[PDB]
Design a protein around this ligand. Structure first.
Ligand SMILES: Nc1ncnc2c1ncn2[C@@H]1O[C@H](COS(=O)(=O)NC(=O)[C@@H](N)CCC(=O)O)[C@@H](O)[C@H]1O
Ligand SMILES: Nc1ncnc2c1ncn2[C@@H]1O[C@H](COS(=O)(=O)NC(=O)[C@@H](N)CCC(=O)O)[C@@H](O)[C@H]1O
Ligand code: NA
Ligand code: NA
Ligand code: NA
Ligand code: NA
Ligand SMILES: [Zn+2]
Ligand SMILES: [Zn+2]
Lengths: 429, 430
C-alpha cells in the first residue's frame, strides 16, 4: 500500500557520506552512485515560448550549484541531460498569436534561455534533447509500453497510459512521490502518451495516426535513450513532482518493466514574490534579463546561495532581498582586493617569515573552516551555512592582513581555497 | 630487532582514496593513509642559497609541486607544507667572503632568485618558509632537549654531537631506518654534529655550550617539529638526501620526542642526470633554471617532468634533444585549445541539430573511460606519464570529432573543463 525504495549497494562505489533530500523517501538519505563515482542526471528543461524569469533562474542556478559541488568539490563524474520542449500547446498558441512558425518561436526562446543561463554562470548540460528531434524515438517508446500492456489506443488515434493495469502489477506503484494527489478513458487519471492532432496543429506520423507527444513522454524517452534504465538523479521544481515526474516514473517503469527508474529525485523549492509562486500566469514575474540590468550574476547567485535549495524562498522586490546580497558581494570583492595586492607586492628579500603564534592561529581557523564547509556540503548541500563559514574566515583574514607580519605562503593557500569554494558556488571575482 | 619496523596509520576516521605511494621507510608501494582526517602535514627540504638553482633542483620541486596539486586539487586532501631555507651554511660563509658582501645579503639574494625561479615554473609556495637564521634560538632549545634525553653529548671545544650508540640501545629507536647499510672528539666516528663551535671570522650565535652554528641536519628536525609536530604525514626530498640527512633527521626528532616514528611516508624524487651523471654544481654539468627559461617555457619544462616518473632517475639530453617532444606536446595542447574554443564560439544553436548521435555517444564513452584511467594512474604512485598519455589520446579523438561530426556543444564544454582540471593539476597554463 506504500511505495518502497531500494538504496543502491555501497560495494565498489564512491562513498562520500553525502546525504540528500530524496523525494522518493521524503527524507534525507545517503547518496550512493549506481556505478563507481558516476552520476547520470536528467533535469527537466524550460518551455521555450517566452522569456525566462527569476523563478526559473532559482531552479537552474540551485542545481548548477549542486552540480558544481558534486563535480568540483566531491569529484563525482556527472553526465547530465536537459530537454527542450520546442513543441507544446503554449508554443502553438503563442506562435499563432504572433504569426510566426512554431520552430522559429521555439529556437528564439531556446537561444535566449541558454544566453540567460550563461549570463548567470550556469553550466550547460552534457546533452540537450529537443522534442522535435526525438519524435521518432517517442513513437518507438510508446510502442513498447503498449506491447507491455500498460497503454491503450483510443478510436481517435490517441494513446493513453493505463494506470489501473500499471498499478495491478506487483512490481509497479503509481504516483510514488505524491500518492495522495491522485469518458473514452478507462479511468479519469489516465494521461495521454500520444495525442491525435487536429489537422491544423503540427503533427507527426505514427502507427496510431497523425499526432503529437503527450505532456510527459518526451522526458522518459530522452533520458531512457541516453542514460538508460537507471538514473542516479532526476531534478526539477517541486511543482513538477506530480503529475509530471510521477508520470515519468510510471512511463519508464512501464517501458523497462522494472520498479525503480530513478534513485534520487531532487526537487527545488519555489521562489515566491509577495507570498505567491513567481508565475507567468500570475504576471508577478521579473525576467532574468531585467534582473541583470539591476544586479550582477554574483549578487543573484548569492541570493540563491543564501536559501536552502529544497525550501521555498520569498523574494522581496524593490531591492529589499538584494541588500544583503550586495553587502556580501562587496565584502568578497574587498577581501580579494586586499589579499591579491598583499600577495603581488610581497617582498621575499626584506620580510621575516618566522611562523608566529598569530600565523598559527589563523592557520588553525583556516583548516577548521575547511572541515566545517565539508560538513555543510555533506548536509544536503547546505550552502547558507557554508557561505557563513567563509564570511567568518574572511573577517579574521582581514584582521590578520592589517596587523600581523604576513605569511605569504599561507595567504596564497587561503586565496586558492576560497577561490576553490567560489568556483564551487559559481561566483567570479 | 636488526631490521626497522614501520607502523601503517589506522584507517578509522581518515580519508581513504586507495592511493599507493612509494615509501622509502618500507622500500615499497604502500597505501597512503593520513594521520588525521584528510590532513597531510608535509615537510620538504629546501635549497642551499648561495648561487643559482639548476634544472635538477627544478625537477625535484616541480615533481613535488605536481604531487601536491594531485593531493589537493585532484583528491581534495588538506595539505599543510613547510620548506626550510638554509641561509647559514659552510658554503654560504665561504662564498660571502669571496663576494665581500654580508652572509645575510648573499643568502637573501639567492633565496629570492630561488623563489622567483619557482614562480616562473608555476610552483606553489609552501604554507611556511623556515629560514635557519630566524630559528637558531629554537634550534638551541631543541638540542638542549636531546641532551636532556641523553642522546647527545658536549665536547670540550663546545660542539654538540648526536650519540648514535646511546640512541640505538633504546628498544624504541633504530638508527638509519631508510639506509641501514650505509652506516677524536667523538665517541664514535658515525656521530654527527648538532652544534658546531664557531671558527674565527665566521658568523656565530650564542648557546649554553659556547658560540657556534647549527650542524647540517638539526634545523630540519627543529623547524618541522615546531610547526608540524611529532608526526609528519609526508617528508620529501631528492634521493641523495635519504642518507645521511633524512635518516639523521629521523634520529634527531625521535630523540627529541622519545618516540619511534616521526614520519609516516618518506618520498624521494629521482635525480635528473645529464650525460649519465647527476646534474651537479660540483661536476659543472648543470643548466640553470634561468638559462633553461630563456629557451623554453614553463609548460614545456613541466611537461619534461610529467613525462618521467617522479621517483625514478631521468636522463636529460641537452641542445634541445629532450625538449623536442615537450615542445611538440605543448604545441598540440595550445592548438587544441585554439580549435575547441573557436568551435564553441562559432556554435549556432538556431541552425544546429542536437540529437544525441552514435558519434556523440562514442566520444562520451571515451571521455568517461579517460577519467577512470587517469584516476587509476594517479592512485598508482602519481603516474603522470600515463595520465599525460591518456589526455593526449583523448585530444586526438576530440580533434577528429570537431572536424567532421556535428558537435554537441555541452559535451565539448564539459570535456574542455575536465582537461582544464587535469592541466591545473599538472600546473600547465593554456
Ligand atoms: N517560481 C519558481 N521558482 C522556482 N522554480 C521554478 C519557478 N517557476 C518554475 N520553476 C521551475 O523552473 C523550471 C523550468 O520551468 S518552465 O520553464 O516553466 N518549464 C516547465 O515547467 C516544464 N517544461 C518542465 C517539464 C519538462 O518540459 O520536462 C522547472 O523546473 C520549474 O519547476
Ligand atoms: N640533479 C638533481 N636532480 C633532482 N633533484 C636534485 C638534483 N640535485 C639536487 N636535487 C634535489 O634538489 C633539492 C635541493 O637541492 S640543493 O639546493 O642542493 N639543497 C640541498 O641539497 C640541501 N639544502 C637539502 C637539505 C636541507 O638543507 O634541508 C634537494 O631535494 C635535492 O635532492
Ligand atoms: Na502494484
Ligand atoms: Na504539482
Ligand atoms: Na634500538
Ligand atoms: Na645519500
Ligand atoms: Zn520533464
Ligand atoms: Zn632537510
Amino acid at each position: 500500500s506504500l511505495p518502497k525504495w531500494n538504496q543502491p549497494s555501497k560495494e565498489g562505489k564512491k562513498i562520500t557520506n553525502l546525504f540528500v533530500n530524496n523525494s522518493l523517501t521524503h527524507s534525507k538519505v545517503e547518496f550512493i552512485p549506481q556505478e563507481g563515482n558516476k552520476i547520470k542526471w536528467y533535469a527537466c528543461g524550460p518551455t521555450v515560448y517566452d522569456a525566462a524569469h527569476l523563478g526559473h533562474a532559482r531552479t537552474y542556478v540551485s542545481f548548477d550549484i549542486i552540480r558544481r559541488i558534486l563535480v568540483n568539490y566531491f569529484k563525482y563524474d556527472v553526465f547530465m541531460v536537459i530537454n527542450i520542449t520546442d513543441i507544446d500547446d503554449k508554443i502553438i498558441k503563442r506562435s499563432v498569436e504572433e504569426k510566426i512558425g512554431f520552430t522559429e518561436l521555439a529556437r528564439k526562446w531556446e537561444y535566449e534561455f541558454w544566453e540567460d543561463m550563461k549570463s548567470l554562470n550556469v553550466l550547460l548540460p552534457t546533452a540537450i534533447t529537443r522534442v522535435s528531434e526525438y519524435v521518432g524515438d517517442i513513437v518507438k517508446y510508446i510502442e513498447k509500453i503498449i506491447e507491455n500492456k500498460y497503454a491503450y489506443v483510443s478510436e481517435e488515434g490517441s494513446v493513453y497510459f493505463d494506470i489501473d493495469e500499471f498499478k495491478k502489477s506487483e512490481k509497479h506503484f503509481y504516483a510514488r512521490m505524491e500518492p495522495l494527489s491522485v469518458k473514452k478513458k478507462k479511468n479519469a487519471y489516465d494521461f495521454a502518451l500520444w495525442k491525435s492532432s487536429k489537422p491544423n496543429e503540427p503533427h507527426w506520423d505514427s502507427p496510431w495516426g497523425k499526432g503529437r507527444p503527450g505532456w510527459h513522454i518526451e522526458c522518459s524517452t530522452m533520458a531512457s535513450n541516453i542514460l538508460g534504465d537507471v538514473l542516479d538523479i532526476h531534478s526539477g521544481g517541486i511543482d513538477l513532482r506530480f503529475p509530471h515526474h510521477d508520470n515519468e516514473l510510471a512511463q519508464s517503469e512501464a517501458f523497462f518493466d522494472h520498479s525503480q527508474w530513478v534513485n534520487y529525485f531532487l526537487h527545488s523549492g519555489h521562489l515566491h514574490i509577495e507570498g505567491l509562486k513567481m508565475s507567468k500566469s500570475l504576471k508577478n514575474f521579473i525576467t532574468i534579463k531585467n534582473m541583470l540590468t539591476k544586479y550582477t550574476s554574483n549578487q543573484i547567485r548569492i541570493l540563491f546561495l543564501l536559501n536552502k535549495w529544497d525550501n521555498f524562498m520569498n523574494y522581496s522586490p524593490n531591492g529589499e532581498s538584494m541588500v544583503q546580497c550586495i553587502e556580501i558581494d562587496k565584502s568578497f570583492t574587498n577581501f580579494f582586493a586586499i589579499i591579491l595586492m598583499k600577495i603581488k607586492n610581497f617582498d621575499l628579500n626584506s620580510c621575516n617569515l618566522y611562523w608566529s603564534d598569530a600565523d598559527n592561529k589563523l592557520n588553525l581557523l583556516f583548516r577548521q573552516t575547511k572541515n566545517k564547509i565539508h560538513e555543510h556540503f555533506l548536509d544536503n548541500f547546505n550552502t547558507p551555512d557554508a557561505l557563513l563559514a567563509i564570511q567568518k574566515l574572511i573577517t579574521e583574514i582581514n584582521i590578520y592582513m592589517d596587523k600581523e607580519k604576513i605569511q605569504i605562503g599561507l595567504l596564497l593557500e587561503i586565496k586558492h581555497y576560497i577561490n576553490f569554494i567560489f568556483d564551487t558556488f559559481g561566483l567570479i571575482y
